[PDB]
Amino acid sequence: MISLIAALAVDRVIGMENAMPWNLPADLAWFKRNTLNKPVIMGRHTWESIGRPLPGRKNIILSSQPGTDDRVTWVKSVDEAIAACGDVPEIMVIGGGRVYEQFLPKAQKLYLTHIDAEVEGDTHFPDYEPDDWESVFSEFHDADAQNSHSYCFEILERR
């Protein structure tokens, strides 16, 4: 079972040239609890964004090019990424856009944070045909002194 986890602003924006213009420590906490002790598949750009391996997660990095960090596992295809996660209850695909697009059709679950932020971005979460997905969990939060925007955690399971 493959799951995607992603934080989307409006128009499904997940990435832009520069850092996201927001501060959303609850979504980071959500990301950590939903990925904890699970293999994480990411693209090389996301790997570079994160800086270091996510602790206590098997980290699997897609690149067409040889790896450049022996702390993590490097694979050259989607199927190699999955195989590299081994035999686990849940693989988390943590992005970015190229990676999500390739994994969404394979995924049984989505963990999406919907952030009420107006951002122009070059990278977007894939369209998930909502007839293919059932929302099983939805939890809205206003912005607050720690979180710059309102946001909603959603879990969807593939029909």
Ligand SMILES: NC(=O)c1ccc[n+]([C@@H]2O[C@H](COP(=O)([O-])OP(=O)(O)OC[C@H]3O[C@@H](n4cnc5c(N)ncnc54)[C@H](OP(=O)(O)O)[C@@H]3O)[C@@H](O)[C@H]2O)c1
């Ligand atoms: N011209 C464009 O508009 C364009 C197109 C694509 C990306 N970008 C830029 O990249 C940034 C973020 O991109 P993102 O979030 O899409 O990155 P991402 O998915 O985290 O990382 C993408 C990288 O992951 C690797 N990858 C993904 N799928 C793979 C596969 N099946 N096999 C082998 N390697 C695979 C490739 O690394 P290697 O690069 O090492 O092969 C690829 O370049 C954005 O700022 C965006 O503008 C721009």
Ligand SMILES: Nc1nc(=O)c2nc(CNc3ccc(C(=O)N[C@@H](CCC(=O)O)C(=O)O)cc3)cnc2[nH]1
């Ligand atoms: N809900 C959600 N929120 C996100 O911020 C998110 N980010 C990505 C990809 N980018 C990143 C960037 C940094 C870290 C990261 O370093 N997380 C730490 C928390 C500590 C910190 O921010 O320095 C972690 O251990 O999980 C993770 C993913 C993928 N899915 C997401 N999904």
